[PDB]
């Protein structure tokens, strides 16, 4: 699955861009803490 991260995460990438995540680092750490959102509509909010 792909995500759109908001804050700064080390060893993972910069802000604004999409990134690959291994599906358990997403919904346990990045998604409950609000540091990343899913990429379904956010590709147009980024544009």
């Amino acid at each position: 699955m792909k995500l759109i991260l908001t804050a700064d995460v080390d060893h993972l990438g910069s802000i604004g861009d999409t990134v690959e995540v291994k599906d358990g680092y997403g919904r346990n750490f990045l998604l409950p803490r609000g540091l990343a959102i899913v990429a379904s509509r956010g590709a147009q909010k980024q544009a």
Partner: protein, 62 residues
């Protein structure tokens, strides 16, 4: 547990076949895992039994 609390997916029954083709009854149980789900970010956590084909989709949040 063996019943999903969202999609209702329970077990199926069948037969276990041996080399001499002796057929006895076993049960195919779903992959029911426990989750602590929220309804809005920062709210309280309710404990549920869900199956892994719903954690793989986005039927719940954590």
């Amino acid at each position: 547990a063996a019943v999903c609390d969202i999609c209702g997916k329970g077990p199926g029954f069948g037969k276990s076949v041996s080399h001499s083709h002796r057929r006895t009854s076993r049960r195919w149980d779903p992959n029911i895992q426990t989750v602590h789900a929220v309804t809005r970010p920062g709210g309280n956590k309710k404990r549920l039994n869900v199956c892994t084909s719903c954690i793989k989709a986005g039927k719940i949040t954590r």
